[PDB]
């Protein structure tokens, strides 16, 4: 399978990237270093992850060491919810750039469609526990994203966790200058996303699948939750192909023309997860994996359900 997908900004994006959410800061520099060494060229980052400085140390070391050139890396970050205001976007981007040690990002995403009240807290809550929104119109946040393109700070802009109607809203934005290049969404056999994916694809927006392994390290895992990695049916497909369950889980989105960003800080897994370009799931496997859909989300984030732009109703 070809390793990159063409975006609607004319640039090519690696279909496999390394996720960094929950990667401990004292481990993520080595994780990114190992990933680059084993072939990853796409790193998925975010300011809210609190580890971009340490990601950046790895990127800069690999650039300085001559292991990779900047043009070959595809570095993604995301505008956190507390920075949706147009006057905050450039500084948020520039802080990410400064921490990642970059002069530009390949892709900068609106992390969530939900703007949160600006301030030092990333997760501002009221006394009762509800997310405190900001009044910013995502179309204005989008225009601020467009300005980053026009200032040279980012090569592409996109969105994340936008539902079908939210994507449509950006696409229908009066005066839209740049279409989103990417919509990054949760996607795996328990959350197959057929409708959203087809819509985005039909519009020339590339979809990135997050939590493709079902995020077993998510902080809110419960015993009753289904477990992709432990699902006998998926294990059986893996066994049939002589691959690990994780490898099946990564290959699945790739064959749907998605980008996929499994996270690990374990060197052996980082390498395992990249070894997915050498086998193919059958049409029957694909259809069978699709059949496991149960609309189950790692990132359900019920604490945000009353936000006006909460995307998962
Ligand atoms: N845009 C968004 O809103 C959003 C939300 C969620 C995620 N994301 C992005 O998507 C990335 C991936 O999602 P995720 O971090 O939620 O979870 P994930 O990639 O589905 O799963 C990560 C977990 O799987 C383990 N793991 C990795 N490879 C494995 C393998 N081969 N065998 C067994 N276990 C393995 C990891 O352990 P170790 O690390 O200990 O090896 C970690 O516990 C994130 O890191 C982030 O970059 C974005
Ligand atoms: C939009 O709302 C979000 C978004 C993300 C989170 C996360 C994060 S940082 N993730 C799920 C990872 C990610 O968004 O990439 C953790 C805890 C609560 C969140 C919330 C929450 F609202 F629940 F506070």
49, 83, 210, 310: the catalytic one is 49
* Number of structural domains the chain divides into: 1
Phi, psi of 105 (to 5 degrees): -100, 145
Ligand 1 proximity of 246 Cβ (cutoff 6 Å): yes
Report CA(301)–ligand 2 centroid distance (Å): 7
Q: Does 169 appear as a known binding residue?
A: no
Report CA(265)–ligand 1 centroid distance (Å): 9
Tokens representing 100 are 């990642």
What is the C-alpha to C-alpha distance for residues 93 and 80, in angstroms, rounded to an integer? 10
Helix (H) / strand (E) containing 13: strand 12-14
- How many beta carbons lie within 10 A of that of residue 277, not counting itself? 14
User: Atom 27, ligand 1: which residue's CA is nearest?
Assistant: 264
Contacts of residue 261, defined as CB under 8 A and 6 or more positions apart, other chains included, come to: 16, 17, 18, 19, 42, 44, 184, 208, 209, 210, 212
CATH number assigned to the domain comprising residue 204: 3.20.20.100
Which ligand has the minimum distance to the alpha carbon of residue 16?
1
* Closest to 246 (Cα-Cα) out of 269, 223, 224, 266: 269
Tokens representing 264 are 């690990």
Tokens 């084993």 locate to 38
Vertex 52, ends 51 and 56: CA angle to 5°?
125
What is the C-alpha to C-alpha distance for residues 233 and 238, in angstroms, rounded to an integer? 9
DSSP 23-90: --HHHHHHHHHHHHHHT--EEE--GGGT-HHHHHHHHHHHHHTTSS-GGG-EEEEEE-GGG-SHHHHH
Tokens representing 145 are 């994203």
Phi, psi of 246 (to 5 degrees): -55, -40
* Closest to 273 (Cα-Cα) out of 51, 23, 54, 16: 16
Domain range holding 78?
1-313
* Closest to 108 (Cα-Cα) out of 82, 83, 138, 76: 76
Q: Please state whether beta strands 157-160 and 12-14 pair in parallel, antiparallel, or not at all (unpaired).
A: unpaired
DSSP, collapsed to helix, strand or coil, labels residue 101 as coil
Catalytic residue check, 178? no
Ligand 1 atom with least separation from CA of 210:
10
> Radius of gyration of the chain from Cα atoms?
19
User: Atom 15, ligand 2: which residue's CA is nearest?
Assistant: 21
Report CA(123)–ligand 2 centroid distance (Å): 8
Ligand 2 proximity of 154 Cβ (cutoff 6 Å): no
User: Atom 11, ligand 1: which residue's CA is nearest?
Assistant: 19
């Amino acid at each position: 399978m070809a390793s990159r997908i063409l975006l609607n900004n004319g640039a090519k994006m690696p279909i496999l990237g390394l996720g960094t959410w929950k990667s401990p800061p004292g481990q993520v520099t080595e994780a990114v270093k190992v990933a680059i060494d084993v072939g990853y060229r796409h790193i998925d980052c975010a300011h809210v992850y609190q580890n971009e400085n340490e990601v950046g140390v790895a990127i800069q070391e690999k650039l300085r060491e001559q292991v990779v050139k900047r043009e070959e890396l595809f570095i993604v970050s995301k505008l956190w919810c507390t920075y949706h205001e147009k006057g905050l976007v450039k500084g948020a981007c520039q802080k990410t750039l400064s921490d990642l040690k970059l002069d530009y990002l390949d892709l900068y995403l609106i992390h969530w469609p939900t703007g949160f009240k600006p301030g030092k807290e990333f997760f501002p809550l009221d006394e009762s526990g509800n997310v405190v929104p900001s009044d910013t119109n995502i179309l204005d946040t989008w225009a601020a994203m467009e300005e980053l393109v026009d200032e040279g700070l980012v090569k592409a802009i996109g969105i994340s966790n936008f539902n079908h109607l939210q994507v449509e809203m950006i696409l229908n934005k009066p005066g839209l200058k740049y279409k989103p290049a990417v919509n990054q969404i949760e996607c795996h056999p328990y959350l197959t996303q057929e409708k959203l994916i087809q819509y985005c694809q039909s519009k020339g927006i590339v979809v990135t699948a997050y939590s493709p392994l079902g995020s077993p390290d998510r902080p809110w895992a419960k015993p009753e939750d289904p477990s992709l990695l432990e699902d006998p049916r998926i294990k059986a497909i893996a066994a049939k192909h002589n691959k690990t369950t994780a490898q099946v889980l990564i290959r699945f989105p790739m064959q749907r023309n998605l980008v996929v960003i499994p996270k690990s800080v374990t060197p052996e897994r980082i390498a395992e997860n990249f070894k997915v370009f050498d086998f193919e799931l059958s049409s029957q496997d694909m259809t069978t994996l699709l059949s496991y859909n149960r609309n189950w989300r790692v990132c359900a984030l019920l604490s945000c359900t009353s936000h006006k732009d909460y995307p998962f109703h």
